[PDB]
Amino acid sequence: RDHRKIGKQLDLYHMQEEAPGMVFWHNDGWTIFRELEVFVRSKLKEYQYQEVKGPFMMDRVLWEKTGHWDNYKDAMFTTSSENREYCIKPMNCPGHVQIFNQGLKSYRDLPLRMAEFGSCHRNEPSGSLHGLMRVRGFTQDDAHIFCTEEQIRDEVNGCIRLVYDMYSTFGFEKIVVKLSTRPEKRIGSDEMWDRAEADLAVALEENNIPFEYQLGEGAFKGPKIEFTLYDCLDRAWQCGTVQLDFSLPSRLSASYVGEDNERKVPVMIHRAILGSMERFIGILTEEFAGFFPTWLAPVQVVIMNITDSQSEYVNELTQKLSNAGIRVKADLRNEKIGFKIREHTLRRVPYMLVCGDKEVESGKVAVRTRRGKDLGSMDVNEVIEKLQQEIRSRSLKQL
Amino acid sequence: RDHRKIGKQLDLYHMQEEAPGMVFWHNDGWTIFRELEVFVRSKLKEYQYQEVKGPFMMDRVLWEKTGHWDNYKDAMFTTSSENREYCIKPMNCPGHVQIFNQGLKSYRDLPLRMAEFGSCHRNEPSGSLHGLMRVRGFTQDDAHIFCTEEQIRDEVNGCIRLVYDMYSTFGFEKIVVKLSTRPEKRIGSDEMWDRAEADLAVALEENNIPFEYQLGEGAFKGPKIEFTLYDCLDRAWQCGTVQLDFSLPSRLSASYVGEDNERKVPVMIHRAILGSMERFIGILTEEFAGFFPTWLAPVQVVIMNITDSQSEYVNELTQKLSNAGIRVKADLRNEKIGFKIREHTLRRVPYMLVCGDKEVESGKVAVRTRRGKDLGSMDVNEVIEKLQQEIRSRSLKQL
Numbered sequence: 001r002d003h004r005k006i007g008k009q010l011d012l013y014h015m016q017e018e019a020p021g022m023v024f025w026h027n028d029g030w031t032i033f034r035e036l037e038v039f040v041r042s043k044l045k046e047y048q049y050q051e052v053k054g055p056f057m058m059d060r061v062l063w064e065k066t067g068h069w070d071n072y073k074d075a076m077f078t079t080s081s082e083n084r085e086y087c088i089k090p091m092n093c094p095g096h097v098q099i100f101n102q103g104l105k106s107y108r109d110l111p112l113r114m115a116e117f118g119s120c121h122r123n124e125p126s127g128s129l130h131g132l133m134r135v136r137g138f139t140q141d142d143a144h145i146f147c148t149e150e151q152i153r154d155e156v157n158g159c160i161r162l163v164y165d166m167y168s169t170f171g172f173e174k175i176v177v178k179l180s181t182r183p184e185k186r187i188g189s190d191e192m193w194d195r196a197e198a199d200l201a202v203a204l205e206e207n208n209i210p211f212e213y214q215l216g217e218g219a220f221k222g223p224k225i226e227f228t229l230y231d232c233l234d235r236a237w238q239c240g241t242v243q244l245d246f247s248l249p250s251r252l253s254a255s256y257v258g259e260d261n262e263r264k265v266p267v268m269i270h271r272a273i274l275g276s277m278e279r280f281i282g283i284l285t286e287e288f289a290g291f292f293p294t295w296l297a298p299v300q301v302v303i304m305n306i307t308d309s310q311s312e313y314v315n316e317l318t319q320k321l322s323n324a325g326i327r328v329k330a331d332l333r334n335e336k337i338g339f340k341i342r343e344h345t346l347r348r349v350p351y352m353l354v355c356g357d358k359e360v361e362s363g364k365v366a367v368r369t370r371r372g373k374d375l376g377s378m379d380v381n382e383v384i385e386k387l388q389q390e391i392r393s394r395s396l397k398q399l
Numbered sequence: 400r401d402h403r404k405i406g407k408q409l410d411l412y413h414m415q416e417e418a419p420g421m422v423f424w425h426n427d428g429w430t431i432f433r434e435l436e437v438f439v440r441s442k443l444k445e446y447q448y449q450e451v452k453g454p455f456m457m458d459r460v461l462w463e464k465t466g467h468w469d470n471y472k473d474a475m476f477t478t479s480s481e482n483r484e485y486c487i488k489p490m491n492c493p494g495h496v497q498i499f500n501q502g503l504k505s506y507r508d509l510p511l512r513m514a515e516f517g518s519c520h521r522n523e524p525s526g527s528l529h530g531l532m533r534v535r536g537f538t539q540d541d542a543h544i545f546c547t548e549e550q551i552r553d554e555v556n557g558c559i560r561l562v563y564d565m566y567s568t569f570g571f572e573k574i575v576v577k578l579s580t581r582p583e584k585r586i587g588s589d590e591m592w593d594r595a596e597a598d599l600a601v602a603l604e605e606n607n608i609p610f611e612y613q614l615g616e617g618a619f620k621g622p623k624i625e626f627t628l629y630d631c632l633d634r635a636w637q638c639g640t641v642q643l644d645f646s647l648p649s650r651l652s653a654s655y656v657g658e659d660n661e662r663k664v665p666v667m668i669h670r671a672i673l674g675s676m677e678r679f680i681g682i683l684t685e686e687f688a689g690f691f692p693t694w695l696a697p698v699q700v701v702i703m704n705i706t707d708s709q710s711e712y713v714n715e716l717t718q719k720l721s722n723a724g725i726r727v728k729a730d731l732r733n734e735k736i737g738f739k740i741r742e743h744t745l746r747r748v749p750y751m752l753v754c755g756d757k758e759v760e761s762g763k764v765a766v767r768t769r770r771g772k773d774l775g776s777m778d779v780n781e782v783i784e785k786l787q788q789e790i791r792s793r794s795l796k797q798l
């Protein structure tokens with residue numbers, strides 16, 4: 001169960017010293033990554049997020065206005081052009097505020113939920129880099145929610161359900177939630193921090209969530225929540241973060257018209273659910289040890305002939321499955337059928353369709369699974385509908 | 400017909416002096432962009448491309464090994480970390496060679512088609528920047544084909560059909576093709592350049608393509624083809640490029656085992672069909688003057704009530720359409736029905752469903768189009784199937 005070894009074994013990705021901490025996503029690893037995006041998007045639709053894309057670098061003077069420059073300038077890559085210094089973005093937050101600031105906002109536009117699969121780069125020490133887990137370039141399932149003070153409970157609610165709904169899809173049902181203890185140096189009124197804390201307290205009670213407090217210092221900009229999942233090995237992984245923010249929107253001159261016709265500053269809620277998706281993919285690789293569920297499997301079906309007689313039939317099938325939206329490949333090589341079956345089993349391909357002479361005469365296929373289960377000869381349309389149901393439901397298990 | 404004005408009008412994107420030449424993609428502009436990706440992917444599947452994602456910067460020493468450093472170092476952004484200099488990638492080609500170089504390749508793996516929606520950055524002079532057309536950061540529908548010498552005709556064929564098939568989807572059927580005149584300084588044998596030229600000549604004849612020659616100097620690395628489309632204003636736009644390459648693969652130590660069991664260098668074919676997609680989107684915006692075809696429209700349907708009686712019904716409809724895969728929005732505001740209809744017309748929303756009292760009692764909706772056409776009251780399921788057909792077929796015109 002080593003995601004770097006399995007990654008090489010299944011041709012998912014690679015890295016090289018030329019781009020330390022930066023992932024070369026091969027076709028099959030990119031297939032997994034994009035199937036995560038579709039999943040995230042399907043929940044974005046459900047909970048009504050926008051999806052945006054911001055620029056990959058922005059003026060240094062802007063980053064200095066966030067206040068992150070002072071604290072974290074050592075972690076940001078910098079480049080210049082025409083005697084102007086830019087920073088490769090390490091976070092998507094300022095960009096989203098930039099999009100919010102276009103056009104006059106009123107209370108009726110809030111809550112405004114803005115999501116981005118944003119690529120960010122940090123200048124991590126090369127010695128801390130480890131596979132997909134600790135990298136320099138990553139994409140996170142980022143989002144930022146702009147809302148009034150009164151909306152914090154309802155919004156945090158939505159983040160909480162989102163965390164548990166998504167993690168369960170992967171088979172993660174053991175989840176620890178840690179609140180944060182407020183620092184002595186913080187931004188925002190004492191009054192502002194205690195109403196928000198009541199909103200957080202009421203939201204956690206509502207979802208019946210036992211929370212611990214985090215023993216270290218919290219964030220200076222607002223209350224913060226972290227979610228930790230446990231995998232089948234009972235290992236703890238911290239992925240979800242919900243970070244209330246009373247500092248960035250005032251610093252970047254965000255405002256909206258309230259019902260009282262007054263320019264208030266909106267509250268910002270930063271939230272990721274999976275965290276870094278490169279990291280998350282590593283986690284899934286170890287969780288399943290390379291036996292990806294059908295919907296995540298890079299290749300879902302391989303169809304094989306026994307001799308060249310059945311070769312035309314297989315190509316028919318491969319196209320027929322591919323029009324049905326199944327990642328399928330035809331294996332017409334000059335190897336014997338046991339060799340093909342063992343080989344595609346070692347490569348963790350979920351289903352394997354064998355086409356002997358009786359299969360062609362019959363309009364069916366012999367089905368073997370990557371666990372060695374023999375499901376017998378089944379109608380072609382039957383295999384298609386069953387496979388589609390498993391894909392769309394994102395079943396963790398097979399037939 | 401100004402894509403920058405329409406872009407502001409339809410809330411597609413924006414730019415600011417903080418990130419010159421770099422696009423802030425708002426929700427609705429990002430919806431168009433992602434609907435282009437899906438379209439490109441659907442043709443990737445048809446012509447069997449891989450899709451990969453490479454790292455966003457790589458060691459300077461690598462870029463020096465391509466030979467592009469000397470010619471074009473002024474156009475590449477540079478940054479460093481730990482006394483090592485990196486370049487923000489201005490092209491995806493070296494990265495794809497890196498993925499190809501993992502693992503032993505033999506003739507049986509070629510042609511190997513590798514596609515990427517790769518973000519690239521060039522340090523263009525700030526005075527040349529213009530809207531979406533001339534930018535510093537762009538994504539192109541990039542691909543690279545690794546193939547034997549004998550495969551050039553069949554591969555170039557595939558690029559040609561790809562160009563015409565894709566352009567026609569948008570209503571571009573006037574297309575000029577320009578071959579290139581070979582430079583005096585070039586890389587590769589005299590023999591190598593003349594067999595490839597026969598492959599190009601035979602492929603162009605096969606598709607009945609009248610070609611001109613480009614009056615300037617060609618590329619030093621291989622024969623090159625450019626495709627120009629003409630829009631409804633008879634303006635010429637150059638988007639497609641097919642660039643044969645005999646220099647990069649030898650320079651980056653790519654090789655494969657031939658049938659003769661000899662390590663040959665593969666031929667590289669670089670091809671983009673739309674070019675920069677930010678640029679291409681600008682082109683479509685002017686081509687349609689903001690009346691995007693339904694499949695590209697950011698919001699495809701708006702459903703409206705006439706008073707709050709019909710308000711519950713509209714919300715039912717909006718969800719029903721949204722489960723059918725339609726980008727739909729409900730307009731329950733306290734404005735009169737003509738105001739809503741004019742407003743969503745000015746925003747070029749294709750279809751508009753009005754729900755009066757008779758509509759709720761009947762299980763139908765009144766349909767008006769953004770051209771002012773009154774299609775009458777229709778069954779709800781009827782509107783759904785018709786809309787789905789227009790979307791999946793990517794019809795340039797409405798009902």
Ligand SMILES: *C(=O)[C@@H](NC(=O)c1cccc(O)c1O)[C@H](O)Cc1ccc([N+](=O)[O-])cc1
Pocket residue numbers: 068072075076090091092093122142143219221241242243270271272
């Ligand atoms: C404040 O921005 C706080 N943000 C987060 O913790 C956060 C979590 C999940 C999703 C999003 O979008 C978030 O912003 C934190 O201070 C952000 C931050 C931490 C570290 C660095 N760094 O370069 O080491 C930059 C920003």
Ligand SMILES: *C(=O)[C@@H](NC(=O)c1cccc(O)c1O)[C@H](O)Cc1ccc([N+](=O)[O-])cc1
Pocket residue numbers: 467471474475489490491492521541542618620640641642669670671
């Ligand atoms: C050689 O790489 C040649 N490539 C292309 O013209 C090309 C066209 C379409 C798609 C792809 O992937 C291509 O590589 C050209 O020399 C590449 C190149 C041109 C300009 C710059 N620049 O930074 O000004 C860099 C690379």
Ligand SMILES: [Zn+2]
Pocket residue numbers: 091092093144270271
């Ligand atoms: Zn954030």
Ligand SMILES: [Zn+2]
Pocket residue numbers: 490491492543669670
């Ligand atoms: Zn290229």
